[PDB]
């Protein structure tokens, strides 16, 4: 119900687009947010989307560098991170929450899509 894209390797200067497939009920009733946790560090909130309405909100840090979109014809939410660098090496989860502004209850979490930033 929150199936995520598979782990992808990337290189600095490029953008990686992660997806979160959501159920019909989840897409229309709840809101989805993206939390990234670089290895050995703490959780971090990048932004969220209310897919029925579509306006996405972003963290102060990731503003101007992250784009969150949803496809109403597919019930999917895509997270897009540009200007990848070493620090961006992290695991990205797509969590679920109610649409209310005061309700930040991440009851459902994504499986986590590890993104690696290195030339390899």
């Amino acid at each position: 119900q929150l199936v995520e894209s598979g782990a992808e390797v990337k290189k600095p200067g490029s953008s990686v687009k992660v997806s979160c497939k959501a159920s019909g009920g989840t897409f229309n009733n709840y809101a989805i947010s993206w939390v990234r946790q670089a290895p050995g560090q703490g959780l971090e909130w990048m932004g969220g989307i209310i897919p029925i309405f579509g306006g996405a909100n972003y963290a102060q840090k990731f503003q101007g560098r992250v784009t969150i979109t949803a496809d109403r014809s597919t019930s999917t939410v895509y997270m897009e991170l540009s200007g990848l660098r070493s620090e961006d090496t992290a695991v990205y989860y797509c969590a679920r929450r109610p649409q209310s502004i005061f309700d930040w209850n991440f009851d459902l979490w994504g499986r986590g899509t590890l993104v690696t930033v290195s030339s390899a």
Partner: protein
């Protein structure tokens, strides 16, 4: 003998001082022309090919939607934006949903929302156009001889096929044994293809008005596009729904093929599968019979016995056709054919297969004659074995005059002013009438274009009533005449 068996046959008698006559050839009609000293001929317009058509617009009759996306702004923050609002392969809509703390805004009000979906065509109509100089008319000229291979047949064994174009509009047909016939046609004034579209939808095609085709409420491509992806009126095949103010959706509006069929009523269906074939319309030609001679005028009357191998059968045109074999000795000979009274004192009818002749002994020849109304007798052969055939024609001369007048009125109703060139031999009355008809038809078409037949009937009744309840006699008569003509045209039109 091709026109025998066609209900829309026309008889054209006589030529001018120049041995020419004006005939309008229609696709479903046949014209048989007769002059005092010329063989009888049948004329049929059997084709009208449009070549090298160019598309000017492809309409979408069935689409689908994909890649639906939505954007929204919380209240008082202006309208939202989507990247797809600038993408031409997307159809977008702006609305207002209700927002609040539950929806995730922090302000209560109507927040703008926009939804976009990618528009794709699955089936389209290609409205091709053709240059008026690419039209080609095929006209078959068959001599009304009586030789068995041409009695109402729709084949080309004896008929001669002449192709007429706007560039080579003067052609002659070599009719073996009858000289040559010169056709001087004016295809350019025929159907005015510069204001018409060739509309091909699926495996069916129509000839339509270009303004009507360009005014269609469907999405279209210019016709120079090879990828779609820039449809114009995409909003006509989609509907955006915001029931209440909680969601905005967009859906396609289902195949428009049947709606197009309904919209195409009153358009003459054409063919466009193996070339653009138009079996509709007319061609005005001037027929030159000067180098046209009867076959066998230097023959001697047969002086033998004929047998009627097929009984006399009457046609729809008041004429009769009889098939006779010959068993005498002088093979190529003039057939002694007459239509007299019982006493053989008077000549009552004229034969249409002018100068019937037996080309071969056991080769039946079938004559067409026009017998008089009432009793008449067809006498075939000479006294030693002469056969006399009784016939009775059921009509009346007054009824024939009424039917002729009605055919004239209907020709004027279908060809408008081109009906003054049918059977025309010049003359000043014909020219005056054609000019008057041209001016009046211009006014009438201006005042009645786009109107259905019920509306025409209503307008005719209204105008007739106005004229009848008119104090002035001249205006009264003019309005009554206009209203009656309007009523006749409304009853005759297919609109």
């Amino acid at each position: 003998m091709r026109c025998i068996g066609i209900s829309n046959r026309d008889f054209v008698e006589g030529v001018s001082g120049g041995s020419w006559v004006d005939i309008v050839l229609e696709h479903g009609s046949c014209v048989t022309t007769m002059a005092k000293n010329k063989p009888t001929l049948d004329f049929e317009l059997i084709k009208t090919e449009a070549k090298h058509p160019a598309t000017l617009r492809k309409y979408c009759i069935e689409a689908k939607l994909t890649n639906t996306t939505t954007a929204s702004r919380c209240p008082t923050q202006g309208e939202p934006s989507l990247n797809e609002e600038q993408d031409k392969r997307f159809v977008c809509k702006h609305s207002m949903v209700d927002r609040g703390w539950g929806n995730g805004c922090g302000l209560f009000g109507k927040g703008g929302i926009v939804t976009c979906a990618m528009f794709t065509c699955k089936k389209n109509m290609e409205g091709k156009i053709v240059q008026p100089e690419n039209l080609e008319y095929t006209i078959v000229i068959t001599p009304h001889s009586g030789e068995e291979n041409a009695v109402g047949n729709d084949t080309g064994k004896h008929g001669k096929e002449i192709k007429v174009t706007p560039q080579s509009s003067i052609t002659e047909a070599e009719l073996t044994g009858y000289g040559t016939v010169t056709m001087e046609c004016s295809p350019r004034t025929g159907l005015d293809f510069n204001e018409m579209v060739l509309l091909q939808m699926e495996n069916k095609a129509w000839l339509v008005h270009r303004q009507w085709f360009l005014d269609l409420p469907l999405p279209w491509l210019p016709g120079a596009d090879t990828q779609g992806s820039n449809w114009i009126q995409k909003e006509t095949l989609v509907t955006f729904k915001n029931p209440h103010a909680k969601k905005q959706d967009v859906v396609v509006l289902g195949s428009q093929e049947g709606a197009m069929h309904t919209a195409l009523t009153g358009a003459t269906e054409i063919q466009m599968s193996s070339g653009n074939l138009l079996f509709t319309g007319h061609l005005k030609c001037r027929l030159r019979m000067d180098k046209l001679q009867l076959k066998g005028m230097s023959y001697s009357m047969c002086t033998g016995k004929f047998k009627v191998v097929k009984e006399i059968a009457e046609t729809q045109h008041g004429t009769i056709v009889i098939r006779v074999q010959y068993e005498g000795d002088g093979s190529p000979c003039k057939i002694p054919f007459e239509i007299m009274d019982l006493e053989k004192r008077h000549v009552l009818g004229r034969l249409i297969t002018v100068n019937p002749i037996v080309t071969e002994k056991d080769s039946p020849v079938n004559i067409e004659a026009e017998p008089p109304f009432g009793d008449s007798y067809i006498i075939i052969g000479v006294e030693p074995g002469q056969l006399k055939l009784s016939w009775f024609k059921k009509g009346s001369s007054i009824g024939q005059m009424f039917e002729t007048t009605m055919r004239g009125a209907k020709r004027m109703a279908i060809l408008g002013d081109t009906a003054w060139d049918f059977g025309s031999l010049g003359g000043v009355f014909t020219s005056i009438g054609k000019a008057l008809h041209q001016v009046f038809g211009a006014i009438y078409g201006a005042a009645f274009s786009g109107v259905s037949w019920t509306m025409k009937i209503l307008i005719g009744v209204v105008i007739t009533w106005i004229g009848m309840n008119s104090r002035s006699t001249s205006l009264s008569v003019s309005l009554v005449l206009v209203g009656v003509v309007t009523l006749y045209l409304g009853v005759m039109v297919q609109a």
